[PDB]
Amino acid sequence: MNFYSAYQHGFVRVAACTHHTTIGDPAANAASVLDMARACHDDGAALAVFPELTLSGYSIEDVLLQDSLLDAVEDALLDLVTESADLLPVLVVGAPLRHRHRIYNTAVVIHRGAVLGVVPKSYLPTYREFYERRQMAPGDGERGTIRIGGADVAFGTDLLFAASDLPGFVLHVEIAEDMFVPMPPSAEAALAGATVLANLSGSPITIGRAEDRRLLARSASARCLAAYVYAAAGEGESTTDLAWDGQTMIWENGALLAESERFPKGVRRSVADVDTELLRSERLRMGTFDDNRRHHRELTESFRRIDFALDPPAGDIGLLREVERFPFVPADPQRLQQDCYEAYNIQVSGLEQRLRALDYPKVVIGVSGGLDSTHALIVATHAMDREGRPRSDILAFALPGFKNNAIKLARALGVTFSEIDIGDTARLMLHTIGHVTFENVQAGLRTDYLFRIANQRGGIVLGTGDLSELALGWSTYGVGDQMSHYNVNAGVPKTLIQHLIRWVISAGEFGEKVGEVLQSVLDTEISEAKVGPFALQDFSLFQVLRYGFRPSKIAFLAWHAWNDAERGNWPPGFPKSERPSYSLAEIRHWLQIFVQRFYSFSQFKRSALPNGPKVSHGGALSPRGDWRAPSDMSARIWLDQIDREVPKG
Amino acid sequence: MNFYSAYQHGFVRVAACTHHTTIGDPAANAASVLDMARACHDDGAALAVFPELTLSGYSIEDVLLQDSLLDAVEDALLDLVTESADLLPVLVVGAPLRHRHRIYNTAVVIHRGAVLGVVPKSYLPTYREFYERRQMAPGDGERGTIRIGGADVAFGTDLLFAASDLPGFVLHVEIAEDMFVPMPPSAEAALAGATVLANLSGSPITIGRAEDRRLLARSASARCLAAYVYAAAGEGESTTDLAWDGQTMIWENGALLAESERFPKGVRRSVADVDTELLRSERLRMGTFDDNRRHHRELTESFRRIDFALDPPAGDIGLLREVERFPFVPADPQRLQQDCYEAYNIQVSGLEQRLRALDYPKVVIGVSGGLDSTHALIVATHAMDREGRPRSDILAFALPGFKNNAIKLARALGVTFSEIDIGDTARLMLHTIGHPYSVGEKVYDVTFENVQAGLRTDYLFRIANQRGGIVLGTGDLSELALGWSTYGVGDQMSHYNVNAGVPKTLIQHLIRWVISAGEFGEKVGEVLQSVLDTESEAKVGPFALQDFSLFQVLRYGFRPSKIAFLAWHAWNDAERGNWPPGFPKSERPSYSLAEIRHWLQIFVQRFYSFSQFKRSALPNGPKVSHGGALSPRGDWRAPSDMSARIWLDQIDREVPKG
Amino acid sequence: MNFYSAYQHGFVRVAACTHHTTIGDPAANAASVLDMARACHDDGAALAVFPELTLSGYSIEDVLLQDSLLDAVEDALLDLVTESADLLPVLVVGAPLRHRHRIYNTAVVIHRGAVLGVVPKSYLPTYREFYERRQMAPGDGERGTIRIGGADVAFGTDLLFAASDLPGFVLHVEIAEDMFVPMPPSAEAALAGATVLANLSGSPITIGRAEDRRLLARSASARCLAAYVYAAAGEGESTTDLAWDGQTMIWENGALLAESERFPKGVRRSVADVDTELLRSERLRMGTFDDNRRHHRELTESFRRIDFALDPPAGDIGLLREVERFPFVPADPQRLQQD
Ligand SMILES: Nc1ncnc2c1ncn2[C@@H]1O[C@H](COP(=O)(O)OP(=O)(O)OC[C@H]2O[C@@H]([n+]3cccc(C(=O)O)c3)[C@H](O)[C@@H]2O)[C@@H](O)[C@H]1O
Ligand SMILES: Nc1ncnc2c1ncn2[C@@H]1O[C@H](COP(=O)(O)OP(=O)(O)OC[C@H]2O[C@@H]([n+]3cccc(C(=O)O)c3)[C@H](O)[C@@H]2O)[C@@H](O)[C@H]1O
Ligand SMILES: Nc1ncnc2c1ncn2[C@@H]1O[C@H](COP(=O)(O)OP(=O)(O)OP(=O)(O)O)[C@@H](O)[C@H]1O
Numbered sequence A: 001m002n003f004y005s006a007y008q009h010g011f012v013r014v015a016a017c018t019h020h021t022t023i024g025d026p027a028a029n030a031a032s033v034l035d036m037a038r039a040c041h042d043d044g045a046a047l048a049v050f051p052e053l054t055l056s057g058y059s060i061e062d063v064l065l066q067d068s069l070l071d072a073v074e075d076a077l078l079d080l081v082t083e084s085a086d087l088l089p090v091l092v093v094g095a096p097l098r099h100r101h102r103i104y105n106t107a108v109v110i111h112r113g114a115v116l117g118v119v120p121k122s123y124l125p126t127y128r129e130f131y132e133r134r135q136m137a138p139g140d141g142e143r144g145t146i147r148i149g150g151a152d153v154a155f156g157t158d159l160l161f162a163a164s165d166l167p168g169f170v171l172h173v174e175i176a177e178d179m180f181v182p183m184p185p186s187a188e189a190a191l192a193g194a195t196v197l198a199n200l201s202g203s204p205i206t207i208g209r210a211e212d213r214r215l216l217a218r219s220a221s222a223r224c225l226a227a228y229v230y231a232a233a234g235e236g237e238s239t240t241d242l243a244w245d246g247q248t249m250i251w252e253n254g255a256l257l258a259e260s261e262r263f264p265k266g267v268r269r270s271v272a273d274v275d276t277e278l279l280r281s282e283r284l285r286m287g288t289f290d291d292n293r294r295h296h297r298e299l300t301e302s303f304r305r306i307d308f309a310l311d312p313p314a315g316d317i318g319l320l321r322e323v324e325r326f327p328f329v330p331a332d333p334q335r336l337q338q339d340c341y342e343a344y345n346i347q348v349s350g351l352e353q354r355l356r357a358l359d360y361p362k363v364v365i366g367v368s369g370g371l372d373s374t375h376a377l378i379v380a381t382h383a384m385d386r387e388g389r390p391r392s393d394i395l396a397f398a399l400p401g402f403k404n405n406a407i408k409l410a411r412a413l414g415v416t417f418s419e420i421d422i423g424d425t426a427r428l429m430l431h432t433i434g435h436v437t438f439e440n441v442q443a444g445l446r447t448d449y450l451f452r453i454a455n456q457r458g459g460i461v462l463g464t465g466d467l468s469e470l471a472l473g474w475s476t477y478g479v480g481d482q483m484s485h486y487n488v489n490a491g492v493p494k495t496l497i498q499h500l501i502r503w504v505i506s507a508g509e510f511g512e513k514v515g516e517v518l519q520s521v522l523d524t525e526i527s528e529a530k531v532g533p534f535a536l537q538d539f540s541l542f543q544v545l546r547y548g549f550r551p552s553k554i555a556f557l558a559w560h561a562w563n564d565a566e567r568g569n570w571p572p573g574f575p576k577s578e579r580p581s582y583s584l585a586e587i588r589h590w591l592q593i594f595v596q597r598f599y600s601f602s603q604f605k606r607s608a609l610p611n612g613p614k615v616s617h618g619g620a621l622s623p624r625g626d627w628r629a630p631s632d633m634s635a636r637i638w639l640d641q642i643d644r645e646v647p648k649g
Numbered sequence B: 001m002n003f004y005s006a007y008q009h010g011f012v013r014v015a016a017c018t019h020h021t022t023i024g025d026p027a028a029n030a031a032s033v034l035d036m037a038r039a040c041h042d043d044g045a046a047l048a049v050f051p052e053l054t055l056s057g058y059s060i061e062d063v064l065l066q067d068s069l070l071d072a073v074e075d076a077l078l079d080l081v082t083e084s085a086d087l088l089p090v091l092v093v094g095a096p097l098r099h100r101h102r103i104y105n106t107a108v109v110i111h112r113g114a115v116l117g118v119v120p121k122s123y124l125p126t127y128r129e130f131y132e133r134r135q136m137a138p139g140d141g142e143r144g145t146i147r148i149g150g151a152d153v154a155f156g157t158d159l160l161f162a163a164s165d166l167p168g169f170v171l172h173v174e175i176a177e178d179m180f181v182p183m184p185p186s187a188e189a190a191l192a193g194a195t196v197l198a199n200l201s202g203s204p205i206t207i208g209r210a211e212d213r214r215l216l217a218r219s220a221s222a223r224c225l226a227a228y229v230y231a232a233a234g235e236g237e238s239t240t241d242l243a244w245d246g247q248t249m250i251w252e253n254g255a256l257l258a259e260s261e262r263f264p265k266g267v268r269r270s271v272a273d274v275d276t277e278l279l280r281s282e283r284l285r286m287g288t289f290d291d292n293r294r295h296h297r298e299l300t301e302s303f304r305r306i307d308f309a310l311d312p313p314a315g316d317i318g319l320l321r322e323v324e325r326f327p328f329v330p331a332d333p334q335r336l337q338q339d340c341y342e343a344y345n346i347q348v349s350g351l352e353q354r355l356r357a358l359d360y361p362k363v364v365i366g367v368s369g370g371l372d373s374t375h376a377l378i379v380a381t382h383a384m385d386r387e388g389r390p391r392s393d394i395l396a397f398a399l400p401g402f403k404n405n406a407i408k409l410a411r412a413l414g415v416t417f418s419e420i421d422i423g424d425t426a427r428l429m430l431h432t433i434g435h436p437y438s439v440g441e442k443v444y445d446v447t448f449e450n451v452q453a454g455l456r457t458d459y460l461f462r463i464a465n466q467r468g469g470i471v472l473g474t475g476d477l478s479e480l481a482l483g484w485s486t487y488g489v490g491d492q493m494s495h496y497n498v499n500a501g502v503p504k505t506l507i508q509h510l511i512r513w514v515i516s517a518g519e520f521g522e523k524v525g526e527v528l529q530s531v532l533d534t535e536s537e538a539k540v541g542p543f544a545l546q547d548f549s550l551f552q553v554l555r556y557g558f559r560p561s562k563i564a565f566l567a568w569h570a571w572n573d574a575e576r577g578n579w580p581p582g583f584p585k586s587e588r589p590s591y592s593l594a595e596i597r598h599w600l601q602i603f604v605q606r607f608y609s610f611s612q613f614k615r616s617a618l619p620n621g622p623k624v625s626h627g628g629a630l631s632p633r634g635d636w637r638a639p640s641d642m643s644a645r646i647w648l649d650q651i652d653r654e655v656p657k658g
Numbered sequence C: 001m002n003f004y005s006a007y008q009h010g011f012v013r014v015a016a017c018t019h020h021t022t023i024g025d026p027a028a029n030a031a032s033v034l035d036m037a038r039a040c041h042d043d044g045a046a047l048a049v050f051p052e053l054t055l056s057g058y059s060i061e062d063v064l065l066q067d068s069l070l071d072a073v074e075d076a077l078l079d080l081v082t083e084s085a086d087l088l089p090v091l092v093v094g095a096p097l098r099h100r101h102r103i104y105n106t107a108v109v110i111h112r113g114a115v116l117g118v119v120p121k122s123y124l125p126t127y128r129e130f131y132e133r134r135q136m137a138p139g140d141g142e143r144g145t146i147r148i149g150g151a152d153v154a155f156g157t158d159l160l161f162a163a164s165d166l167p168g169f170v171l172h173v174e175i176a177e178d179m180f181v182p183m184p185p186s187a188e189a190a191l192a193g194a195t196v197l198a199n200l201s202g203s204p205i206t207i208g209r210a211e212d213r214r215l216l217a218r219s220a221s222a223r224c225l226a227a228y229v230y231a232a233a234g235e236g237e238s239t240t241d242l243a244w245d246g247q248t249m250i251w252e253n254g255a256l257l258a259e260s261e262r263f264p265k266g267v268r269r270s271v272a273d274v275d276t277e278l279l280r281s282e283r284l285r286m287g288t289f290d291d292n293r294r295h296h297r298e299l300t301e302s303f304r305r306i307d308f309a310l311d312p313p314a315g316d317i318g319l320l321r322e323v324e325r326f327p328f329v330p331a332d333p334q335r336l337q338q339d
């Protein structure tokens, strides 16, 4: 295979273009369109959407009904179609066209020298600044064919254009106002199989209108588990009563892939790589989406599927797509902040309800001065505060084997702190057994002690292990740190933990003295030896748990995010010496460890998991929630996929 | 309320009657029917189904077409209807009736002085000994009304009769051949809401025909989650070319509630209490049943619902129903044997797969000489045998605290046996924690009990890490149910629990099964026998009672008072009903309502509220019983932080003190 | 006339409530609901929406299938209905209810002593943290009636509740997941006449989920030219595998009227005055909205319209609504800057 190719990893490259309108002059419009389409070709784009009524200009009013204008529009269309024989992408260009008795506001789907379909606008606004019914007929419920340059081509609202060599790409087109009505044509189309929803728009600009466009294109892409590709008219449209801003944008399942400069001087394009596998994966999992389809069966099976062969470029054309290094840790500081706020409150209110139900037992927790146990202590304290419980009911324990951060924190917090040396009990145990086992004896004895103390002192044992450890099965199962009465950290991956700790510092709700210890814990604490860097395994975890992406897809993504430390963004808090870059060889190596550990070795540990709250939209690993899987399965096929598909280095 | 009333607990009493046919003489047939219906009334029955063509006789052939015969049938029907004003049950009686152009083979649904509906047979056999098309029209797709004694009453295949004061009781009727076709009218009816399916039959008898009747009545009751009430013609029918056996039977979701003597001299009835709550519960849970309905929406919403008010007797009328003392342990020896065979093989193959997947680790198991650990050791041994593994790869441990059966068994089996005294480690731990026992006081704490229980598991896990094995869990389903186990570090935890789905009441019977089969030598049998003979009930109650409650709750979700009614009918009287094999006369206790109530309170509290967090983090192991297992990944998804207040309150308000 | 009265100016006062869940204990939930409903009465609210499965708790899983739970839910419902004889607002309260073969996830529309309708959730998520199909039947395409306390009342996804003395207030109800599918029930309902769209939600909370809820409630209120009234579950729901944030919000044609504190200690309400005339005016003008209706004529005329008389308070009850002094000049500096 050809591993650096975005197309071979399930991306499809799409473009939303805003050209230079010359109102009333189709040849000029077509020349601008042709020139932008050639650019899109050069970029390896599979799709290029233009503004509403591209070929005539949207704003020319009764000029639309002039014979010479309609004649010139047809002549220009035919030239485009002919030029398109040498162009990679499907071009979606607007045109007022004659059909039966009237002119329809249409989008003309053009590919490799042929017209694939012609789609009329369904809803024609005739209110405020809009007069569309005056010149143009509604397309809703038109079917059949239309005659364009000596061919009969599909015509109507019910069309789907499907790439026969790229099944994740199924195109539907609507027009401007179409997406603003309670039941848009695009929403039935997605149910029928459309994955990429195009919109050609005129859209005179107005205070707050760009927000309206966004609210609707974004919600559409989210509700319809689709890419939404949008292109509005700019410079050149008539300013007799209106102004135009040239806005273009591309959305994917709620997320902005790209957008262009508003009120540009000159033409602009948004170009992005859409992840069809992401959309595929979201739909596979959200059954209620298919349920909705079945419920509108007749509405949804009546669409007509026009096939074409894209034949996209096979080689390296980069990845026009932002890939976060930390799926669980947003690089944008406003967002990271929001996430931390939510994580923390989730953890706390999860624990509060447990305590309420147990009529407020004491909280037993082993504190080692490590990141996980520190954060848990803080979570426990806040829980107890919010529930009006004395902090002295939290029973913290240092359990030395064979750090001072731990006693310092407990003391600053004002919980009950205690030390218990497990060493002698360990020796006694090691000897009685005739002695990994030696590490497990200590790990087990810690949990054993904590559970017995909890029995004795009327408390529950707080679990401490994080989601990343659950994922790799990095924990001692049974009698060991895997086991507890309630685990507040179970849904928090390791990459996010350090950020919650800062959040709690930065907010400063626990005094200045507490913050200093916490700061110390951080500075001191920053395993990865045998299971690899958690930044890489948390990356893989998100891809697998959310999308079920195959290993080579995960390696491609991780490599685009991580191979170059100067590229992309780092969340806040990474001084310049903590900004590693990973080679493909490293990413491959750790991925092998990951799939082996995650699919095969580690499930039985998750299988018997104490209670605790889901935190990340990426998923948690509860066998009672997000991850139902066998404890007795090999990972052969994943390892084999990495062998066959991911280059050695 | 009125606790000893079967109606107030959701039962409906149904009857399948076989009368005395007098062919060609409707007055006589009606007199027989009237007499049987009065008996049914006396019995508090809500329903009485008679044989096909009751009023004329099924076998009279072209005599069905005679005006005087048809006129007499009508006259007789109207007298029944009038007599029925004083009768409790809905009577379903057969009659050849004129409608439009022809006579239809009908069942006339009759209640408290009115005709509720008339239902024509849908499929009329005209082959081998059957000539029904010659005299009678098919009913399939007839609708509308028909005129019976100056009233227009519903007519057709699409009727449902619903008790307005007893919503679990929704009656559908079909006729004989109707239940034998690939898509019977009764199957669309059950989808539409019918819960009790009636069948009036003529059914000349033939070698092997009673089996056919049962195969189809039983499978119908099972596939349609319903009661199926069936009545065939008997003595009196013409023996010109045929004989008749008078068979009657009542099925409920695949189970025979009642049947009557074949070839009786005289009339016979099958009378049984149908549990509408059981049918309700099965349907609530099997969503694919509702799914089937929605897929045949148009077919299923077109039924017409005729209402009637039953107004059943409110008092004590007994319970015409067999209630097993041991929902998990069948009293019938053939059946118990089948169950044991299956339980055992399930346990074993469950463990074999785990071992295969772990590339054959050693098996570490704590053996205390108790029932659970004994049975597990056996299970382990068989697993190893079938996988061609040396028995010396099973590592059994006695773990004495502060029995010889245990070392005897391990030794006879030939596994690796070893003792480890956990007492010193325990002392060291009790002292390290500052427990009063370490300075002398006899504080037989729970902490003190848990230190030992915990240390056992801790040891076993460490040995497992050391010696390359997995720890076999040992706790049984009944202990999972009551949260009777030490959670976390303790006997609740393990790498694979083969006993997790086996309730305690069944364990002793698996041990005998293994003895009785004798596949492990005579020496092994003797120790096992010893374990039995040699082998807490005081804090959680008798497991026979808690296992009974467990089944009701886990399978059906029945409310506490319903469970108490059932347990009391099963258990209050030791001479009543049957005991599985293996209960000598002094192990046959009876329980009072006061006891059953008392333990039920303990059960709902422990099961709905306290114990769930223990189940919530449960090691892998196989489901065994059709009653269910308690894996939070399978049969039982519930909250760890919920109170049982409403169940306790229901017991207070509904179940008498004693 | 009576000029200082919000109702006489075309407003209708609506409330989205988050109560205290006591899982498995319907009497307790109902007591909390009753108490919040009385508050809403006192505020002159016409409408009070509660969280999904209010009476039982959304999170109780197979406990939904327990007879004693379902029995208690019914008893509790009947007491609310009876208490509601003296309450001004239409209460919309969640309840698992038995119908035909199964239990449906329902919202019970209650008003002045009677049940107006019962609406089942249409889309039951069974993925990730959701297992709803295990215990509950889909409501899409259910019609007819259901028996609640000796009455046969409208049942199904196709219901509209219309105030006969306040025509700008036409209520439709959906549930949680209903609003997340490409073609939600609420969108057809708005085309059919619904102006106020209620949503009862359980909605375990998760990083970024509150954004999702907003994106979809806000876009719905905008695309459907309607108020969208939304109430999620809070404290008391089981934290076996999930946490809850108690979020409540009220949208109007894309604009946030009100919202409540996330992860509150105690119960919270969003209360706002919805301008029915504003909705009325937007619809009069955007012909393409009616055009959409006509295009789905058969879909949209099949709704059933249940009438009730609100009889709202006639006097001065203030105006629970922010009115900018400068319709053309936003007071929020970020926004004014954008403009
Ligand atoms: N598929 C399966 N089904 C049922 N049981 C299975 C099993 N696979 C192994 N087992 C059993 O499980 C045991 C192996 O698992 P386990 O006992 O947990 O031990 P294991 O994962 O092999 O070792 C734990 C490792 O994690 C490290 N550790 C320890 C403590 C804390 C942390 C931390 O960072 O928080 C890390 C420590 O360095 C140690 O090397 C064996 O007894 C094996 O027989
Ligand atoms: N909802 C919840 N979520 C998280 N944690 C919860 C909890 N509820 C209690 N806990 C905690 O769990 C602990 C209570 O459970 P646990 O530690 O197991 O102990 P617990 O259930 O209090 O006692 C176990 C009892 O079972 C009997 N037992 C034990 C072992 C074996 C056998 C046998 O013969 O089969 C019988 C023994 O007599 C003992 O009294 C306490 O620390 C409590 O605070
Ligand atoms: N010395 C200790 N004293 C008290 N508790 C401990 C001690 N060591 C481990 N624990 C308990 O067991 C858990 C797991 O141990 P582990 O050594 O993985 O934790 P850590 O020190 O937070 O991380 P790391 O090993 O990566 O520095 C801890 O979070 C803590 O609750």
Ligand SMILES: Nc1ncnc2c1ncn2[C@@H]1O[C@H](COP(=O)(O)OP(=O)(O)OP(=O)(O)O)[C@@H](O)[C@H]1O
Pocket: B365, B366, B367, B368, B369, B370, B371, B372, B373, B397, B398, B399, B400, B401, B456, B474, B475, B491, B536
């Ligand atoms: N003395 C013991 N020696 C070895 N293992 C033990 C011992 N006591 C308990 N165990 C282990 O822990 C499990 C639970 O112990 P428990 O004493 O409850 O079992 P039991 O004796 O079968 O039960 P019961 O006391 O009700 O007969 C045992 O089945 C076994 O795995």
